[PDB]
Amino acid sequence: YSGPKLEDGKVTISFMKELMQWYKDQKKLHRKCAYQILVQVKEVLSKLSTLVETTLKETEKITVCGDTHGQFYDLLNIFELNGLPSETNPYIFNGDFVDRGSFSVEVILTLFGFKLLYPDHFHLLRGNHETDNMNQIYGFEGEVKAKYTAQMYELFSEVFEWLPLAQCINGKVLIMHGGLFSEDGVTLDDIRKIERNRQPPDSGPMCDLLWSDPQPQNGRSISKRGVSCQFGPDVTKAFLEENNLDYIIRSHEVKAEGYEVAHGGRCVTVFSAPNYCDQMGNKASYIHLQGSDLRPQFHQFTAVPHPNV
């Protein structure tokens, strides 16, 4: 019998290497492990706010990634080639982990495991696809039900209800996926004073926070959904000047070349989603930021075909 083992409540390197080989054997972990890992991430995250002040020195390097959509095999290849993860090499992913992903649940649970390994060195921000509105109706709920039972589903939902929105790094970098409201007067405090462990909203400006994205052209383009629309470049430039940001590199916008410098050249969009839905097969890349190299560092990797499982 190869039953579970907890060691001092601490997830150790040998143990999740054993877990990686177990998942290469493609079996199912016993439900009590799910119980303790879920409760532990529950207390460790529930104490974490939307904005937590974390300072990273010029001697520390940080790894950030684009839209991956649960490429678990590519993550294993990263662990294999890029070296063992370190306290001085935090990894951050720019949302969009789920939907169109058939085993992103294993990805997210091993991410919670790594959070147990590094509770103050792995941080993520809520994406716009991690919402029950589209997950319940458009097949992701069916995927969850095929995988597991409804009680664990509501457990993951209530865990996700505390997901943060915005981060500040180095006092020079501001991190978010969606963006801003359509109107001026946006502070960090108003979002901070909004209690987020409640019923998720359907739409509106709070939905604009994670879905409204700027456009490379100027002006104000009406949203094709018929509700609200993407706010103009005057707001963006005013906020750029006020919040002392130079530029940001993000994703969730389709580029033929896999990257582009747009918005009058003031923003960088990178496509690190290789062959999403088996369509583009574009190059992927992840970015290292550190004090010793002021320009962002780019590592470009490519994906491989995966078994039809």
Which method was it determined by?
cryo-EM
Tell me: is residue 225 an annotated ligand-binding position: yes
* CA geometry: angle 194, 196, 198, nearest 5 deg: 120
Give the number of other Cβ atoms within 10 Å of residue 209's Cβ.
Answer: 22
Q: What are phi and psi of 205, to 5 degrees?
A: -60, -35
Largest interatomic CA distance in the chain: 64
Residue written as tokens 């996926």? Answer: 177
- The number of angstroms, rounded, from the C-alpha of 242 to the middle of its chain's C-alpha atoms is 26
CA–CA distance, 29 with 43 (Å, rounded to integer): 22
* H helices present in 118-198, as ranges: 132-137, 140-147, 150-160, 188-192
Tell me: is residue 67 an annotated ligand-binding position: yes
In DSSP terms, 293 is beta-bridged to: 290
CA–CA distance, 116 with 85 (Å, rounded to integer): 14
- The number of angstroms, rounded, from the C-alpha of 256 to the middle of its chain's C-alpha atoms is 22
CA–CA distance, 95 with 164 (Å, rounded to integer): 11
Active-site residues: which are they?
A: 129
Enclosing H/E stretch for 91: strand 91-93
Tell me: is residue 96 an annotated ligand-binding position: yes
In DSSP terms, 230 is beta-bridged to: 221
Enclosing H/E stretch for 36: helix 31-46
Tell me: is residue 184 an annotated ligand-binding position: no
Q: Is 275 left (phi over 0), alpha (psi -120 to 50) or beta?
A: left
275 exposure class (CB count in 10 Å sphere: 0-12, 13-18, 19+): middle
Residue written as tokens 């707001």? Answer: 235
Give the number of other Cβ atoms within 10 Å of residue 135's Cβ.
Answer: 19
Q: Which domains does the chain have, with CATH numbers?
A: 13-301 (3.60.21.10)
